[PDB]
């Protein structure tokens, strides 16, 4: 069997785990910003729906839940 | 179903042994058992020293109680056998006779 392929998989994985450790803090900020933008996009899509329907505002009693914040 | 209770009782005199046997059979009947027969295997030295109810036993009386009881009774009986101070060790098994003696054609 290909032992080079498994050793290449090991080196690639080990190198990757070093990168995430080094940049763990920068990654967290990127992820939280991405989640914020994704929530904003979801809200915009919902607003698009109730605007196209005809309603000038959201359905009575409706509050867009935060479905991505941990 | 049909069960066999193997009872290792304390080495006592005849009156206390009779009283303990009567109490055990009475508990069996109270839990709904139909007792078929009571066998005495004898008073003998235990294969090993057994510690029960803060007492050490090297000798004991061996008895067998064959009976028919509902499935729910067995657990209860076990707990009762745990409380009786004159019982060194009680064990309920499915009666060996109910086990079927399948026949063999020999070594293939």
């Amino acid at each position: 069997k290909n032992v080079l392929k498994i050793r290449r998989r090991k080196m690639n994985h080990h190198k990757y785990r070093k990168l995430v450790k080094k940049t763990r803090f920068l990654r967290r900020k990127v992820q939280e910003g991405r989640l914020r933008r994704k929530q904003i996009k979801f809200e915009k899509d919902l607003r698009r729906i109730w605007l196209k329907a005809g309603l000038k505002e959201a359905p009575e009693g409706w509050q867009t839940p935060k479905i991505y914040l941990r | 179903p049909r069960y066999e209770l193997a009872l290792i009782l304390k080495a006592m005199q005849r009156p206390e042994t009779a009283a303990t046997l009567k109490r055990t059979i009475e508990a069996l009947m109270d839990r709904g058992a139909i007792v078929r027969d009571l066998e005495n295997l004898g008073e003998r030295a235990l294969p090993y020293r057994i510690s029960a109810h803060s007492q050490q036993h090297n000798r004991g009386g061996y008895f067998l109680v064959d009976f028919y009881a509902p499935t729910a009774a067995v657990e209860s009986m076990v707990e009762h056998l745990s409380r009786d101070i004159d019982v060194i060790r009680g064990n309920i098994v499915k009666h060996p006779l109910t086990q079927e003696l399948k026949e063999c054609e020999g070594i293939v």
Binding site: - | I8, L64, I88, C104, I107, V108
Partner: protein
């Protein structure tokens, strides 16, 4: 032709070999029998290459021995000395 061979099961087929306990009931209370398959010095259960028993009866003997040992009928670390003079059925010799 009347002399042609006829289809038939082997009439000379010898009866298939039996273990010494075949057809007999193994009970956990029969400590005398269960003691014939344990080491006199350590109480260890002999394997089938020593006892000569079949797989089914080997399993039956093992289960009966364990049940008797745990229920206070048979010693574990040695064979009961009362059964040391019973017939020897195991193929083992300590030159003792």
């Amino acid at each position: 032709n009347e002399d042609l061979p006829i289809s038939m099961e082997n009439p000379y087929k010898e009866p298939l070999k039996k273990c010494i306990l075949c057809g007999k009931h193994v009970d956990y209370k029969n400590v005398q029998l269960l003691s014939q398959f344990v080491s006199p010095f350590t109480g260890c259960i002999y394997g089938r290459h020593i006892t000569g028993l079949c797989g089914k009866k080997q399993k039956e003997i093992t289960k009966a021995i364990k049940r008797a040992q745990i229920m206070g009928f048979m010693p574990v670390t040695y064979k009961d000395p009362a059964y040391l003079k019973d017939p020897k059925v195991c193929n083992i010799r300590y030159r003792e």
